[PDB]
Amino acid sequence: QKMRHLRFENLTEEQLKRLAKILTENLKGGEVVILSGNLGAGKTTFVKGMIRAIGLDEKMVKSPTFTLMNVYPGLKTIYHLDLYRLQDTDFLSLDVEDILEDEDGIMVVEWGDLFDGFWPEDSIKVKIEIADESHRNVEILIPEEVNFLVEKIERYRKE
Amino acid sequence: QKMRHLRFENLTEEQLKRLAKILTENLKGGEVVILSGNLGAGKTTFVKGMIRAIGLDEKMVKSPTFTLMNVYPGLKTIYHLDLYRLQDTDFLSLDVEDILEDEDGIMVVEWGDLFDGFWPEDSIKVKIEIADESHRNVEILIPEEVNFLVEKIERYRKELQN
Amino acid sequence: MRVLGIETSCDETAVAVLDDGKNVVVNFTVSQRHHLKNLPILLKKAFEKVPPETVDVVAATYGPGLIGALLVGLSAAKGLAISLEKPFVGVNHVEAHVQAVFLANPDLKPPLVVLMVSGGHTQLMKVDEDYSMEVLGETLDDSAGEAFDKVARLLGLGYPGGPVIDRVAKKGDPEKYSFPRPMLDDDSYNFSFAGLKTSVLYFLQREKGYKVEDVAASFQKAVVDILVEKTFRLARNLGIRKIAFVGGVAANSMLREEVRKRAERWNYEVFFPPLTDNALMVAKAGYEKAKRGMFSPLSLNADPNLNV
Amino acid sequence: MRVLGIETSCDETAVAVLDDGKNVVVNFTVSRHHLKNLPILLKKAFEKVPPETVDVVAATYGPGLIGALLVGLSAAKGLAISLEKPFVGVNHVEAHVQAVFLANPDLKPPLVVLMVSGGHTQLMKVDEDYSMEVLGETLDDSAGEAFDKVARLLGLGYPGGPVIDRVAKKGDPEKYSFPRPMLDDDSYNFSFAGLKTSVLYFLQREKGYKVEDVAASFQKAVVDILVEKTFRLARNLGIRKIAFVGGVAANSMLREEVRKRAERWNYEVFFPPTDNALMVAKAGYEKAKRGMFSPLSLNADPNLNV
Amino acid sequence: MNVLALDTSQRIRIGLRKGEDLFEISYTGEKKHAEILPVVVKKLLDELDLKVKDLDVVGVGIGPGGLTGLRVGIATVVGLVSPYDIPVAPLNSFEMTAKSCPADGVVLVARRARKGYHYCAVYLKDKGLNPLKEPSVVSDEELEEITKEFSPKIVLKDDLLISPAVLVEESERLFREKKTIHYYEIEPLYLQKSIAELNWE
Amino acid sequence: MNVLALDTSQRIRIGLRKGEDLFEISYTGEKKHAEILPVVVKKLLDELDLKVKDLDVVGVGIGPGGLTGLRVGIATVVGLVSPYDIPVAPLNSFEMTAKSCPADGVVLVARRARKGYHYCAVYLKDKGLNPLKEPSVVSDEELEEITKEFSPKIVLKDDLLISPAVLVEESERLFREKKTIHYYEIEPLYLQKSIAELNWEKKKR
Ligand SMILES: Nc1ncnc2c1ncn2[C@@H]1O[C@H](COP(=O)(O)CP(=O)(O)OP(=O)(O)O)[C@@H](O)[C@H]1O
Ligand SMILES: Nc1ncnc2c1ncn2[C@@H]1O[C@H](COP(=O)(O)CP(=O)(O)OP(=O)(O)O)[C@@H](O)[C@H]1O
Ligand SMILES: Nc1ncnc2c1ncn2[C@@H]1O[C@H](COP(=O)(O)CP(=O)(O)OP(=O)(O)O)[C@@H](O)[C@H]1O
Ligand SMILES: Nc1ncnc2c1ncn2[C@@H]1O[C@H](COP(=O)(O)CP(=O)(O)OP(=O)(O)O)[C@@H](O)[C@H]1O
Ligand SMILES: [Mg+2]
Ligand SMILES: [Mg+2]
């Protein structure tokens, strides 16, 4: 299946956060969220926005570059991956595979554009590009969720 | 109710005990032995000779007329019953039935003949009769367990000249 | 020390609550058969009067008796221990009988000999100064009670044999006929009665125009001789002049007389019970053990052939 | 007191036997896959040391990876059960701090310490009773992370830190003036994500620059924000003994700038000279003699701190 | 809620539920019921730190089984709950056996009795068991007849296996559906008595 | 003889045989494996008065199951038997599930994985356990094809039942047949390897 792309040009930091909130508060359990973006793109600060939807502080979202995995246990459990410093594939094979068995918890993956083969086909892809020093562009791919894309285009239309 | 009878005549006390031993040591387990015989026929005395085969003392064999059932835990388990005093059938129905599910414990019932219907069809009947003041007669009813008959007839030879 | 006692050793079911000594707060019996059906009822009625939180110790007979009957009281008692979070005492029933001699007479000297004669029990036992006891004499065959009952049957007299033989022998002539005293003049304090029983059977098989009254009395005297000799002989060889009689056949007027006659001659204290209360007997025995802080483990199995 | 130490928090799997906290009787290291490796190492250990001799078993219960930790933690409790000896679950961060007092025998209990590494950047107070709390903490990236990712951005090899260290020596700091993201705040917290991106923006904008100059100016940014917040806290808590633990503590620029500030203001500053398998045993031994053992019901938590 | 359930029909099966924690214990050995049942109940209650008075309901296996086993069982429970009149959930042992099987369908439960007689029942285990044939005694030949009539999928013979978890569930269910009894109302399944009468007839 | 067997592939399952005594324990609760397994093994061994060194073999469930569960499991055993090199009996979790069922015949065992995938084996249990299809990862569709093909009598899915008594029997069997291994030889059944590799092929197609 082919996901509906929802483009967003020149978002501020808080606008980007708010979007992350809107998305995550609106999905059900057991979804994968692939964050694509190069260094400096708000991959991790997007997850700040995400944690708002699980009624936790933004302060506890921190880069998993070294920790490899952060889990935020809230209204829903968020698994925050950062594949930047991944050396051993077996972590995906075993550990990450074991998480994908969780049927009511969300996974977001910084640098999840690596190892394309691995992720479930119906994964939510999120791409972030640098517009200027204080603005970003994001395009969100969501596959055939009647309720999802509708709730997202609302904020797209709320520009 | 006719099966293989093994008559013996004018047995002394120790001859009767030795017969009890020779019968019981040849039992496999989970068999019922009904002792018929009038008062002082020599039933409890026969169970005295039965306990030899479970390598215990004869001294612990005592009439269970009041105790209802004695249990002798030896090389096998002997359930010595005495239905002389029994008045409530439920004891047979519950307590005795439960025991009959045991596959490798011997049961010997002084005055079993009183409740004839209750017992399994494959029961070993032992009838005792008082020949004289010091001698008794025993007959053993055994149905199809031809194995034991061989060992019991061997005894006959030891009693040949008495 | 509120001690709850359960009795399911044979026949009537029983529950009693007792205080420090003889301070009966509650004593319920079934007699006023089917233990498992009965026991809950009794425990209900007991807890209706006594608050359960008050009981300090739970005690029940662990033998001797019927494996099946015993298990009901034994098991229930352990459950009561577990729920109440109090200690449990598994009592010996023969020791309980003996204990009640000291209960029935508060001022009794510890060093004591005791004959126990009933259906299904015939023994001689020594009680030490510290109240420990061993069985020194024992029936190898039938009990004196059995002899009485089975002989009464042979005479065609209603149950129980003891009372009947007792009554009819009063009109009969003892030692009209002379039946053996099987174990008399032994080195031992042990008893046999099966030889006496069959003897009577032979006499009745070699029938005559005998009186039944005569046979009964002659049998009775035979038994009361062998009971008196071995009891007094021991008490002698042990240097005790206090001797107590317990069990059903202890009610035999012939024995009572013949003991009393022989205990007038030698200054000997003889103790008989009155012409019951099986629940309290357990509670007492429990309390006694509780005081010495001798409690029973929860892994305690019932054995039907408990003695000593 | 022979203490057996298990390490499955770090990438190397390790098993160490230590006598009295100071004597290595045996130290085995794999040199990753903990469940495959650990049994081999325990084999090798028990071939040399007799099992009866072990007095206490010790392993890390966090922080780290839930999966990596459980293997060591789980194994140690089993050893504890089978040996019939007590078990100590060691807090890894706590153990690092205690090694400052191990390196320096004559060290006063009241101390302030900066932990600056990859994925760890915090300021902690050590009380007199040797209890410790985290007072300052990074909200975004670690300092080490900033070094590694900025090095990448600059087009410099791994590892970020030592490479940026070396190239900055040929450069002029304060040539360019990057932001000090949390400096002059009412908090002892740190931020580095802002700094990291600021470098990127400069790399996108400017053209004529020297790499040496950018590196040294970025380094001096970081080393300013580290030095200020560290000495500010030491001041407001009246402690003049301060210790620098962690990977980026290696940085010669930081070392110099700390030393300068610690000659003017009269302060004692302590730096490190790590061994992993022993450090667990050493922490275990230390807790064992205070009779402070861990329950068998202890789960691993991967975000253990303080 | 807090539930203690136990069945002593064959082996000793004890389930205990305290809030979110469900423990199952079983025993098979030489040791008799009387010497092993109370020992475990005591320790398990100690370990979960709960007094009997803290129990909501206590389930007991009464269904067809070994007389002396059932006796030890029911008695034990009577002792535990008598001081507090805790709701008792009578459990059919044969039903507990069938319900303990993972697969569904037509299930025959068959245990040996004296000399070629059997305790026997058969059920349908879709969601909860529905009884096809009520528990009763049968001959060796009558069992075989029952076997071919019903063509059972699962046959539980002699070595009946009860999960204590099942016992707990059932108690919970019986407590909910207001079908619990007092300790003085317990009626066992005395299937053995029949055997004598059926032999005659 | 003395045998301890455990499987933590799903719930905590512990069997312990001391001569003529067999004790079984299961735990279903919110507590994690790491919180409960050692605690019980300690208590059961204390209560039976059994040193670990007294054990003759220790069975361990390795077969397809939850990663965290199997890890706590295997590692615990590694710790228990390492000081004494006690023979280890590796136990295929599924096979134990199949054997745990009373009925005989064709048996399918299944466990959910990553959405749209399943761990799956099928066995013939008639006389002994004869493997019809070995444990492997299958797509939701491929499972249904297998069900149809093998027409199984018993289906065990999602909520597996393992009898600790069965775990012991198997350990004893394995001990008899000289099929036990050292604690440093254990190789788990990580079916979560296959699933990533299949996703790639079918994601491309
Ligand atoms: N529109 C915007 N959205 C997000 N962040 C923005 C932004 N404008 C500016 N920023 C700044 O950009 C920085 C984003 O940092 P991070 O979220 O760490 C990027 P990342 O992609 O997660 O890093 P990584 O590539 O090292 O993993 C913050 O300092 C933030 O304030
Ligand atoms: N040949 C013989 N065999 C057995 N006993 C003999 C005997 N000759 C004499 N006796 C005696 O006869 C008596 C046998 O009686 P017991 O067996 O003790 C009672 P019972 O026959 O079991 O019937 P009961 O149920 O009425 O008590 C003993 O005194 C025994 O010594
Ligand atoms: N007046 C009497 N004379 C002789 N024997 C008597 C008697 N009154 C009762 N008995 C005997 O006493 C026996 C019954 O005793 P009970 O006291 O009723 C129970 P028990 O048999 O004593 O039980 P126990 O020995 O298990 O404690 C019977 O054998 C009966 O014949
Ligand atoms: N001389 C130096 N100068 C500056 N940074 C340095 C450095 N040596 C190492 N670093 C940095 O320190 C980090 C690695 O620190 P280490 O403590 O060795 C492992 P860590 O990943 O930081 O451990 P942690 O998980 O306990 O935080 C890297 O980001 C590296 O660039
Ligand atoms: Mg990041
Ligand atoms: Mg007799």
Short mmCIF file of C-alpha atoms in Angstrom, two decimals, chain E:
data_model
loop_
_atom_site.label_atom_id
_atom_site.label_comp_id
_atom_site.label_asym_id
_atom_site.label_seq_id
_atom_site.Cartn_x
_atom_site.Cartn_y
_atom_site.Cartn_z
CA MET E 1 -9.24 -10.45 45.35
CA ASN E 2 -7.79 -13.14 47.63
CA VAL E 3 -8.65 -16.74 46.85
CA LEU E 4 -7.39 -20.07 48.20
CA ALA E 5 -8.42 -23.20 46.33
CA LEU E 6 -7.38 -26.81 46.79
CA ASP E 7 -8.25 -30.27 45.51
CA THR E 8 -7.07 -33.53 47.10
CA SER E 9 -8.99 -35.92 44.80
CA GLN E 10 -5.71 -37.48 43.71
CA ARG E 11 -2.56 -35.44 44.13
CA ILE E 12 -2.45 -32.31 46.27
CA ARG E 13 -3.35 -29.27 44.19
CA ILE E 14 -3.31 -25.82 45.79
CA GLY E 15 -3.98 -22.49 44.11
CA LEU E 16 -3.69 -19.16 45.91
CA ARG E 17 -4.51 -15.74 44.50
CA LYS E 18 -3.60 -12.53 46.34
CA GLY E 19 -4.53 -9.49 44.27
CA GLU E 20 -2.43 -9.70 41.11
CA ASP E 21 -0.42 -12.78 42.12
CA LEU E 22 -1.43 -16.35 41.26
CA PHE E 23 0.63 -19.23 42.62
CA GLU E 24 0.06 -22.90 41.84
CA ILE E 25 1.57 -25.76 43.87
CA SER E 26 1.26 -29.50 43.32
CA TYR E 27 2.68 -32.55 45.08
CA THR E 28 3.11 -36.20 44.06
CA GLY E 29 5.05 -38.52 46.39
CA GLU E 30 5.05 -41.18 49.12
CA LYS E 31 3.99 -38.75 51.86
CA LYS E 32 0.30 -38.90 52.79
CA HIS E 33 -2.14 -36.00 52.42
CA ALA E 34 -2.44 -35.45 56.16
CA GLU E 35 1.32 -35.07 56.47
CA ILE E 36 1.83 -32.67 53.57
CA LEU E 37 -1.34 -30.63 52.78
CA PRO E 38 -1.35 -28.47 55.97
CA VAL E 39 2.43 -27.95 55.76
CA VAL E 40 2.18 -26.30 52.33
CA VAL E 41 -0.99 -24.26 53.03
CA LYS E 42 0.82 -22.83 56.08
CA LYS E 43 4.02 -21.83 54.24
CA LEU E 44 2.22 -20.47 51.17
CA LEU E 45 0.03 -18.27 53.38
CA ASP E 46 3.10 -17.11 55.31
CA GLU E 47 5.01 -16.33 52.09
CA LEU E 48 2.19 -14.24 50.62
CA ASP E 49 1.80 -12.65 54.08
CA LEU E 50 -1.97 -13.20 54.20
CA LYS E 51 -4.04 -14.35 57.17
CA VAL E 52 -6.95 -16.69 56.46
CA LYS E 53 -9.32 -13.95 57.66
CA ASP E 54 -8.07 -11.94 54.67
CA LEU E 55 -9.51 -14.55 52.27
CA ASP E 56 -12.56 -13.71 50.13
CA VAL E 57 -13.42 -17.31 49.21
CA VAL E 58 -11.92 -20.78 49.65
CA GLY E 59 -12.41 -23.44 46.97
CA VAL E 60 -12.32 -27.17 47.80
CA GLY E 61 -12.34 -30.23 45.57
CA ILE E 62 -15.19 -32.53 46.68
CA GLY E 63 -15.81 -34.33 43.38
CA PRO E 64 -15.15 -38.05 42.73
CA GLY E 65 -11.81 -39.05 44.23
CA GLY E 66 -9.93 -41.05 46.87
CA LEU E 67 -12.01 -41.06 50.05
CA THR E 68 -9.11 -40.44 52.47
CA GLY E 69 -7.75 -37.74 50.13
CA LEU E 70 -11.11 -35.91 50.01
CA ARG E 71 -11.51 -36.29 53.77
CA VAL E 72 -8.13 -34.69 54.60
CA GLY E 73 -9.02 -31.96 52.09
CA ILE E 74 -12.55 -31.02 53.17
CA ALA E 75 -11.61 -31.27 56.84
CA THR E 76 -8.62 -28.97 56.33
CA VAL E 77 -10.85 -26.32 54.75
CA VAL E 78 -13.45 -26.74 57.52
CA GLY E 79 -10.72 -25.94 60.06
CA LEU E 80 -9.45 -22.90 58.15
CA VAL E 81 -12.74 -21.12 57.53
CA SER E 82 -14.80 -22.15 60.58
CA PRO E 83 -13.42 -19.27 62.76
CA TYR E 84 -14.52 -16.64 60.20
CA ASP E 85 -17.32 -18.30 58.19
CA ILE E 86 -15.51 -17.64 54.90
CA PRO E 87 -17.54 -18.46 51.73
CA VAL E 88 -16.68 -21.98 50.53
CA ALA E 89 -16.71 -22.89 46.83
CA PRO E 90 -17.38 -26.64 46.32
CA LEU E 91 -15.53 -27.81 43.22
CA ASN E 92 -16.38 -30.86 41.13
CA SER E 93 -13.04 -32.63 40.79
CA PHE E 94 -13.93 -34.32 37.49
CA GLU E 95 -15.03 -30.96 36.08
CA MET E 96 -11.79 -29.38 37.26
CA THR E 97 -9.87 -32.13 35.46
CA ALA E 98 -11.64 -31.56 32.13
CA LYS E 99 -11.39 -27.77 32.42
CA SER E 100 -7.65 -28.18 33.09
CA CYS E 101 -7.05 -29.66 29.62
CA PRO E 102 -5.88 -27.04 27.03
CA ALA E 103 -7.61 -28.42 23.92
CA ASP E 104 -11.40 -28.18 23.57
CA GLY E 105 -14.06 -30.68 22.55
CA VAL E 106 -15.49 -33.97 23.81
CA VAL E 107 -13.51 -35.10 26.84
CA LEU E 108 -13.84 -38.37 28.75
CA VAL E 109 -12.72 -38.45 32.38
CA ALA E 110 -12.15 -41.99 33.66
CA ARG E 111 -10.57 -43.24 36.90
CA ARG E 112 -9.99 -46.84 38.02
CA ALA E 113 -11.92 -48.38 40.90
CA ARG E 114 -11.97 -51.85 42.46
CA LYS E 115 -11.73 -54.80 40.06
CA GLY E 116 -12.90 -53.69 36.61
CA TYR E 117 -15.18 -50.79 37.60
CA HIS E 118 -14.70 -47.07 36.83
CA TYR E 119 -15.70 -43.58 37.86
CA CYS E 120 -16.67 -41.86 34.62
CA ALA E 121 -18.01 -38.65 33.09
CA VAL E 122 -17.72 -36.98 29.69
CA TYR E 123 -18.10 -33.29 28.81
CA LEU E 124 -18.08 -30.75 25.99
CA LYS E 125 -15.44 -28.07 26.52
CA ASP E 126 -16.37 -25.21 24.16
CA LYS E 127 -16.24 -22.20 26.49
CA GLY E 128 -17.14 -23.92 29.73
CA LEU E 129 -17.72 -27.66 29.98
CA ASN E 130 -21.22 -28.92 29.29
CA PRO E 131 -21.85 -32.44 30.73
CA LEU E 132 -22.60 -35.06 28.08
CA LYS E 133 -22.69 -37.83 30.69
CA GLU E 134 -22.95 -37.15 34.45
CA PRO E 135 -20.23 -38.71 36.71
CA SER E 136 -21.14 -42.27 37.72
CA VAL E 137 -19.72 -45.78 38.15
CA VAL E 138 -19.43 -48.04 35.10
CA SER E 139 -18.07 -51.51 34.34
CA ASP E 140 -14.98 -52.17 32.21
CA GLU E 141 -17.22 -53.03 29.26
CA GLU E 142 -19.67 -50.17 29.81
CA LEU E 143 -16.79 -47.69 29.63
CA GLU E 144 -15.72 -49.14 26.27
CA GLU E 145 -19.31 -48.76 25.05
CA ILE E 146 -19.31 -45.13 26.24
CA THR E 147 -15.94 -44.62 24.53
CA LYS E 148 -17.17 -45.64 21.07
CA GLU E 149 -20.57 -43.94 21.39
CA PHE E 150 -19.00 -40.53 22.03
CA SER E 151 -15.68 -40.99 20.20
CA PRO E 152 -13.91 -38.59 22.65
CA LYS E 153 -11.08 -36.33 21.51
CA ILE E 154 -9.40 -36.10 24.92
CA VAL E 155 -9.32 -39.13 27.23
CA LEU E 156 -8.17 -38.46 30.79
CA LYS E 157 -7.66 -41.90 32.34
CA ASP E 158 -6.27 -42.78 35.79
CA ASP E 159 -3.66 -39.99 35.95
CA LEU E 160 -6.02 -36.99 36.13
CA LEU E 161 -4.34 -33.59 35.88
CA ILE E 162 -5.79 -30.51 37.59
CA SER E 163 -4.30 -27.04 37.24
CA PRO E 164 -4.70 -25.09 40.53
CA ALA E 165 -5.22 -21.95 38.42
CA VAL E 166 -8.48 -23.54 37.17
CA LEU E 167 -9.50 -24.16 40.80
CA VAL E 168 -9.00 -20.47 41.59
CA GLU E 169 -10.96 -19.27 38.55
CA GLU E 170 -13.88 -21.57 39.39
CA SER E 171 -13.99 -20.37 42.98
CA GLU E 172 -13.94 -16.74 41.81
CA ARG E 173 -16.76 -17.58 39.39
CA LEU E 174 -18.80 -19.36 42.07
CA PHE E 175 -18.33 -16.43 44.46
CA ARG E 176 -19.51 -14.03 41.76
CA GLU E 177 -22.55 -16.07 40.76
CA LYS E 178 -23.62 -16.38 44.44
CA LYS E 179 -23.30 -20.18 44.43
CA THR E 180 -20.96 -20.53 47.43
CA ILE E 181 -21.83 -22.51 50.57
CA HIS E 182 -21.03 -22.49 54.29
CA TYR E 183 -18.50 -24.92 55.76
CA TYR E 184 -21.31 -26.84 57.43
CA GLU E 185 -23.10 -27.53 54.16
CA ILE E 186 -20.34 -29.44 52.33
CA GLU E 187 -21.56 -32.63 50.63
CA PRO E 188 -18.85 -34.86 49.05
CA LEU E 189 -19.21 -37.08 45.97
CA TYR E 190 -19.27 -40.58 47.44
CA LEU E 191 -19.29 -42.39 44.08
CA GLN E 192 -17.61 -45.45 45.67
CA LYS E 193 -20.65 -46.56 47.69
CA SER E 194 -22.52 -47.52 44.52
CA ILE E 195 -19.92 -50.08 43.34
CA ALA E 196 -21.10 -52.65 45.91
CA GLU E 197 -24.79 -52.29 44.95
CA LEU E 198 -24.11 -52.39 41.19
CA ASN E 199 -22.08 -55.60 41.53
CA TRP E 200 -25.07 -57.33 43.18
CA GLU E 201 -27.42 -55.95 40.51
#
